[PDB]
Paper text:
[name], a member of the conserved TMEM16 family, plays a central role in the initiation of blood coagulation and the fusion of trophoblasts. The protein mediates passive ion and lipid transport in response to an increase in intracellular [name]+. The protein is inactive under resting conditions and becomes activated in response to an increase of the intracellular [name]+ concentration. Fungal TMEM16 structures have defined the general architecture of the family, where subunits, consisting of an N-terminal cytoplasmic domain followed by a membrane-inserted part composed of ten transmembrane helices (α1-10), assemble as homodimers.
The pronounced coupling energy of 1.4 kJ mol−1 obtained in a double mutant cycle in the background of the strongly left-shifted F518H illustrates a strong interaction between both residues in the active state of the mutant protein. To probe whether this interaction would trap the protein in an intermediate state by preventing a further separation of α-helices 4 and 6 to fully open the subunit cavity, we have determined the structure of the double mutant [name]/[name] by cryo-EM. In this double mutant, the truncation of both side chains precludes an equivalent polar interaction as observed in F518H and would thus permit a relaxation of a potentially strained conformation. However, the structure of this double mutant does not resemble the open cavity of nhTMEM16 and instead shows very similar properties as observed in the mutant N562A, with two predominant channel populations. One of these populations is symmetric with both subunits residing in a [name]+-bound inactive state, the other is asymmetric with one subunit showing an inactive and the other an activated state. Their similar size indicates an open probability of about 30%, which is somewhat higher than observed for N562A. The conformation of the activated subunit strongly resembles its equivalent in N562A, except for a small movement of α4 resulting from the removal of two bulky side chains, and there is no hint of a further opening of the cavity, which provides another piece of evidence for conformational differences in the activated conformations of [name] and nhTMEM16. Remarkably, we find a similar arrangement in the corresponding structures of the activating mutants N526ACa, which concerns a residue that is neither located in the α4-α6 interface nor lining the pore and the double mutant [name]_[name], where both side chains forming a strong polar interaction in [name]+-bound states of F518H are truncated.
Author numbering:
A (entry chain B): 50 to 78, 91 to 119, 121 to 143, 202 to 219, 233 to 253, 264 to 414, 451 to 475, 509 to 638, ...
B (entry chain A): 50 to 78, 91 to 143, 202 to 219, 233 to 253, 264 to 427, 449 to 487, 504 to 587, 591 to 639, ...
The structure:
C-alpha cells in the first residue's frame, strides 16, 4: 500500500530517504492473487520489516525493497545465537520471509533476491582485486568473499582452492612419473620389437567386427604402442600408489581445514515405498548405463561430448526432480540430500559409465572368434581397440577433463551473460535495478558447481591409473574454474542469500565413497586393464631358464608368444585373452599363461587394496582431523 | 578424625551414633608422614566430610576410616559435576572430593581405599542371592540394580557381555545347523568315502614328512579323520562363514544403539571434567623413552614368535618319537602345550607391561589406560592368535616337493585335506581350556587370596569383613574385556574352521557373567563406581577385528580350507578332456590331484631309499607328475587353483564389505524408540 519512485541516484546503496538500507528485493507485477499477496505483505509488516514498492523506469513491474530494522535482525540473530554486514542481514530477512519459497514457486510472486553492492563498497574491490581477469594469479581474499557472498559459497571456494593445491602436488608428482615413463621409451623392448618390420610387420591381429573391419598390419599398432608404453610403465605404478596416499592426505588435511574454518567463522550453527523407489532408481541407472555405453579435431569432439552431457544432465535433473517428491519427507535438508545423491548417481553413470566400459568391458565379455557372445540382432560385442584400452581411457579422460572443463566454464560465463544481455534488451538506471534483469541464482545453484568439481575429483582419482597428467589438467582447470565461478557470481548472477556451511555438504560422504572406490578401481585398472602384471610375469618366469630361453631374465620373446596362434573356425589372430595356441589337447581355452595372468594381477590387486587401505587407516590414525594451532586457539 | 573403635553392631553401615550412613573406606596404619597425613585429614575437615576412625580388633596398628559426606556437601558437589543421594552417587561424590588421595595412597601413608558393601553375602545380599551366584545362572541380570550398586562402567560391561551372549546364541544356532548339514552329507562325501575305501584309500602312498625315521604313511591311517574332515570343509561351513560376516555386521551397530539407549537411560553423558594427573606422573614431572618402550614391545613380540617357533621345532622333534595316527596326538599335545605357554607368558607380560607403562609417563590416567590397552591387546593378540595364524596361513604352505625340499629346518607339512582339522583341534583346545581352566582360576585366585589372608588372622564389622578381600585396582574390568575380545577374535577371525565356535563360546559367556559377578561381590571388594558411556578402546579394536575377520575368513576358506580345490575339480576336471566322467562329480579327486613322485632326489642325503622300498609316492601338491616334460614342477592346476582362491577372496571380500556397508547404512545407529524418548 506504499509506493515511491526515484531512479535519480545511480549508486543508491540506500532508499530514497537514504537512511535505510537495501536488505532484499521482491518483484510484484488475479483478484484472489492480489488478496493473498496483500495478506502476505500485511503479515510481513506485522513482523516488523519496512517495505517500499517502486515502479521501474521501463511501467508495470514493481520492485518491493525490504529492510529489517536493527532490533528485529538482532532478535533473529539471537534466535540463531550498520553493525551487521549485508550478508547476515540478507540471510536473516530470508529466514523471516520463509515463515516465501512457496509463494515464489507459484505465479503470485515472481522473484526475490538480496541486493548487490555496486557495479564494476566491496563488490568493486573483490571484483578488480579478485574477480576481474586482471587479477587471476593472486589468491582470493577468502575472508572478503565470505563476508560478501556467504559461508556456503565461501566454503565452496576454499575447498576449490585447497583441492587445487593438492591437485598441484599430485600433478607435479604425476609429471615426474610421466617423464620417467616418457624418457624410458627407447629402452622399452616391447615397443621397439613391435615397431620392427621383421617382427611387427609379419604378426597379425584379429578384427573387431564380423567382416566389416578387415585384417590389418601392426604398423598402425606399432606407431600407437609408443604412447601406450609411455602410459604403461612402472611410473604409472608409483603414481597410482602415490595417488592412493594423496587421496588420504587430501581428505585429512581438508578435515583440518574444515575444523580451522569452523573455529574462525563459527560455521557450526543450529536452528516398502523406499524399497520400490530404490528398485526404480536402480532400473533407471542401468537403463542410462546402457544408453551411454551404446552412445560410446579434438575441439569438435569435446564440444559434441559437452552438448550430449548437457542434454543428458537436463534429462537427469527432470527425472530426479520427478522421483524425489514421491519419498519426500517434507524436510528441506533430507530432500536436498536425496536430490544430491540421485543427481550424483545419474551424473556418475553418465560420465564414468563410458570410462568403466573402456576399462573393464572392452575385450572382457568377448569369447574367442570361435563362438563369441551373441545376444540379439545386434551381435559381436565390440573388442578393445588394438592400440590399447589404456590409450583409449587416457584419450577419453583428457578430452573430458580438459575440453569439457573449458567448455563448461565458457558456458558458465556466457549463458548467464547472454541471458542478462537479452534481459537488458527488453538511459541510466540505478545499480540496484539491473540485478532484477540478470537471472536469479537457480534453486541449489551451488550444488551444480559442487557436483562439477566432485565429477572432476572422481575423474582424477578413480582413473589415475591410466595417465598421470589428469591432476595437471584438473589443476589448470581449477585455476580457471575458481575465477570464472567468482566472476559469474560477482557480475552475472544476482547476490545469493547467504547460507551457513559447517562443511561442503553431502559431497563429503560422496568423496569418501569415491576414495574407497578409487582405490579399488585403480587396483583393478592396473591389473585387469593394464597388461603390466602379465608383462612382469612373462619377464620373470618365461625369461629365466625354467620357462624361458634367456640366461638372465629379459622381456625378449614376449611378443612372439602373446599372439595366440589361430585357425578360423566358428591365418592366426588374437583377441584380448592369453589363450592356448594349437598343440594343447584343448585350444581356444583358458591357457596355462592365463591362469598365471589372472592370479598374478588379482593377487597384485589384493596386495594393493590391502596395503593402500592399511596406509589410509594408518594416516587417518596418525594424522588428527584437528590441527595443533586450531586446538591452541580453541583452548583460548 | 574422631578416632574410636566399636565393632558393636556386626552389620550396620551407620556411625556409632547411627545418625549418618557411610560411603567409603580408607585403611591406614613416621613423624613426617604422621604430620602429612593429619594435614589432609584437616583438609577433608575443611572440605566438610565426616570420617570415623576405628582401631580394629584383630591388629592394633590397623586403623579403618569410614567416609561419608553431609547433605550440603553432597548437594554442592553434585552441582560441581553434572536418601536422595543414592549410594553410587555418594561414592562418586566422595571420591571426586578426595581427588580434588591418589598420591597419599600411593605414597603408602594411606594403605588402601574402596567402597563399602551393604552386608555379607541389603543391596549386596539381594545382589548375591538372585545374582552373582551359580544357582541364579539362568536369570536376567539386574542391570539397573548393578548400576545403582557398582557404577556406570560396570553396568555397561555387563550389558555388553549379555548382548554378546545373545548374539552368540543365534550365531551358534546357525553354526550348529551348518555342522549338521555337513554331518548328514558325510555319508555322501565322495573324497572321504574314497579315503576310507581300501580299494582306493588303501592304495594311497603319501610321501614321508620328515627326512629321518618317518615312514610313507598311507591315507588309511587318516581315514577316520577324513570322516570328520569333510564336515569341516563343506559348503555348509562356507555358508556359515558368509552368515558370520553378516552377524559380525549386525553386532556392533545394535551395540551402539543400546549404548546410546543407556546413555539416555542412565544419563551417562555428564560433565567430563579435566582429568587429574596420575601421582607417579606428577612425582617426576619422553619421546625417546616412548620409542624405547615401543622397542621393548616389539622385541617381546618376536619372543612369543620365537616361542611359537619352538612349538614348530617341538612338533618336528616329537612327531618322530610318536611315529615310532601319530600326527593327531602330536597336534593335540602341541596345542595343549601352546595353550599352557600362552597362559604362562600372559601373567609375565601383565606384570612387565604394568612396569613398562609405569616407566613411561602418561599425563592422565586415561592416557595410561589407552597405552596399556594398545600394548596389552597387541601382545595378547600375538599370543593367542600366533599359533592359529601359523596353522591357518603358514603350516604346510611352503614345502616344495620331495626333491629339494624347503629348509630353514624342514618346515612342517600337512595332510591332503589341509590343516583345517589341526586348526579346528587347536581352536577347540584353546577355547575349551580357556573356558574350563581360565574360569576355574578366575574363581579360585581371588578365593585363594581370601583364604591365605584369613590364615594370617569372631564377631567382625563391615570394614574388617571387606578389607580382608583383594582390592580390585584402578584397571578393573580391563582383563575381562580383553578375555571377551580374545574370544571374539577366535569366534569371528577363525569361524571358517568349525561352525560350532560360538556354541562352546556361548557356554563361556554364560558362565563368565557369573564367575566375574561372583568375584565382584564375594571375593574381591566392591569396586568404586566409574562413569563410562562406552566400552572404550575395545570397540574400535573389534571393528578392526571385524575388518580383519572378513579377510581372514576368506583367506581361511581360500587358503586354509581345501574346498576351492574340490570345487575346481568338480567343475573343471571331471570333464573328459580333463577327466573321464560324462557329467560333473567329485570321484577320482584323490587319484587325480596329488601327483606322484618317482625317487630322484637332489643331493643337496636321499633318505627315501633308506627309509623304504617304494617307487612312486604321492605328495599333497598339484605340481608336475612324471611323464611331464618339466616334471616335479608347477603346472596349470596349481595356478588355476590359486587364481580360484584369490578370486574367491576378492569376491567374498567385496561382496561381504558391500553387505556390511549396506547394513550399517540402512540400519541407523540410533533407535526410533530411543529418538522418541529423547524428543519427549
Ligand atoms: Ca569446468
Ligand atoms: Ca563451476
Ligand atoms: Ca585424525
Ligand atoms: Ca574365561
Ligand atoms: Ca571371567
Ligand atoms: Ca551403521
Amino acid at each position: 500500500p506504499e509506493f515511491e519512485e526515484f531512479n535519480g541516484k545511480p549508486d543508491s546503496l540506500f532508499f530514497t530517504d537514504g537512511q535505510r538500507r537495501i536488505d532484499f528485493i521482491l518483484v510484484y507485477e488475479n483478484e484472489k492473487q492480489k488478496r493473498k499477496r496483500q495478506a502476505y505483505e500485511s503479515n510481513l509488516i506485522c513482523h516488523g520489516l519496512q517495505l517500499e514498492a517502486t515502479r521501474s523506469v521501463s511501467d508495470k513491474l514493481v520492485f518491493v525493497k525490504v529492510h529489517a530494522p536493527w532490533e528485529v535482525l538482532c532478535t533473529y540473530a539471537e534466535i540463531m545465537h550498520s553493525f551487521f554486514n549485508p550478508a547476515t542481514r540478507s540471510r536473516i530477512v530470508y529466514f523471516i520471509l520463509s515463515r516465501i519459497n512457496r509463494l515464489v514457486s507459484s505465479g503470485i510472486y515472481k522473484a526475490a533476491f538480496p541486493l548487490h553492492d555496486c557495479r564494476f563498497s566491496e563488490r568493486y574491490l573483490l571484483y578488480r582485486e579478485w574477480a576481474h581477469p586482471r587479477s587471476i594469479y593472486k589468491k582470493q581474499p577468502l575472508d572478503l568473499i565470505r563476508k560478501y557472498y556467504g559461508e556456503k559459497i565461501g566454503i565452496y571456494f576454499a575447498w576449490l582452492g585447497y583441492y587445487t593445491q593438492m591437485l598441484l602436488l599430485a600433478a607435479v608428482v604425476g609429471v615426474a612419473c610421466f617423464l620417467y615413463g616418457y624418457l624410458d621409451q627407447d629402452n622399452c623392448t616391447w615397443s621397439k620389437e613391435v615397431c620392427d618390420p621383421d617382427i611387427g610387420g609379419q604378426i597379425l591381429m584379429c578384427p573387431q567386427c564380423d567382416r566389416l573391419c578387415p585384417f590389418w598390419r601392426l604398423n598402425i599398432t606399432c606407431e600407437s604402442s609408443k604412447k601406450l608404453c609411455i602410459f604403461d610403465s612402472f611410473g604409472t605404478l608409483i603414481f597410482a600408489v602415490f595417488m592412493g596416499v594423496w587421496v588420504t592426505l587430501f581428505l585429512e588435511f581438508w578435515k583440518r581445514r574444515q575444523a580451522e574454518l569452523e573455529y574462525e567463522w563459527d560455521t557450526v550453527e543450529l536452528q516398502i515405498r523406499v524399497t520400490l523407489c530404490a528398485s526404480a532408481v536402480f532400473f533407471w541407472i542401468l537403463l542410462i548405463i546402457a544408453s551411454v555405453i551404446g552412445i560410446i579435431t579434438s575441439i569438435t569432439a569435446s564440444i559434441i561430448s559437452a552438448i550430449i552431457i548437457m542434454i543428458l544432465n537436463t534429462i537427469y535433473e527432470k527425472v530426479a526432480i520427478m522421483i524425489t517428491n514421491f519419498e519426500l519427507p517434507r524436510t528441506q535438508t533430507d530432500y536436498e540430500n536425496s536430490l544430491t545423491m540421485k543427481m550424483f548417481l545419474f551424473q556418475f553413470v553418465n560420465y564414468y559409465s563410458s570410462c568403466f566400459y573402456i576399462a573393464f568391458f572392452k575385450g572382457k565379455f568377448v569369447g574367442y572368434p570361435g563362438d563369441p557372445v551373441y545376444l540379439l540382432g545386434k551381435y559381436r560385442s565390440e573388442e578393445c581397440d588394438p592400440g590399447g584400452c589404456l590409450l583409449e581411457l587416457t584419450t577419453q579422460l583428457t578430452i573430458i577433463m580438459g575440453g569439457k572443463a573449458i567448455w563448461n566454464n565458457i558456458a558458465e560465463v556466457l549463458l548467464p551473460w547472454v541471458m542478462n544481455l537479452i534481459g537488458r534488451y527488453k538511459k541510466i538506471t540505478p545499480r540496484w535495478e539491473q540485478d532484477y534483469h540478470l537471472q536469479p541464482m537457480g534453486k541449489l545453484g551451488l550444488f551444480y558447481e559442487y557436483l562439477e568439481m566432485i565429477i572432476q575429483f572422481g575423474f582424477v582419482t578413480l582413473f589415475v591409473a591410466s595417465f598421470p597428467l589428469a591432476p595437471l589438467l584438473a589443476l589448470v582447470n581449477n585455476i580457471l574454474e575458481i575465477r570464472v565461478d567468482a566472476w559469474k557470481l560477482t557480475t552475472q548472477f544476482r547476490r545469493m542469500v547467504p547460507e551457513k556451511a559447517q562443511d561442503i555438504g553431502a559431497w563429503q560422504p560422496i568423496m569418501q565413497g569415491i576414495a574407497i572406490l578409487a582405490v579399488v578401481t585403480n587396483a583393478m585398472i592396473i591389473a585387469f586393464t593394464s597388461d603390466m602384471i602379465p608383462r612382469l610375469v612373462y619377464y620373470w618366469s618365461f625369461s629365466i631358464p625354467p620357462y624361458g630361453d634367456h640366461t638372465y631374465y629379459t622381456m625378449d620373446g614376449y611378443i612372439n608368444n602373446t599372439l595366440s596362434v589361430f585357425n578360423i573356425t566358428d591365418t592366426l589372430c588374437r583377441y584380448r585373452d592369453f589363450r592356448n595356441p594349437p598343440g594343447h589337447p584343448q585350444e581356444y581355452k583358458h591357457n596355462i599363461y592365463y591362469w598365471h595372468v589372472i592370479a598374478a594381477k588379482l593377487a597384485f590387486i589384493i596386495v594393493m587394496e590391502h596395503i593402500i587401505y592399511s596406509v589410509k587407516f594408518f594416516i587417518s590414525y596418525a594424522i588428527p582431523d584437528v590441527s595443533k594451532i586450531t586446538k591452541s586457539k580453541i583452548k583460548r
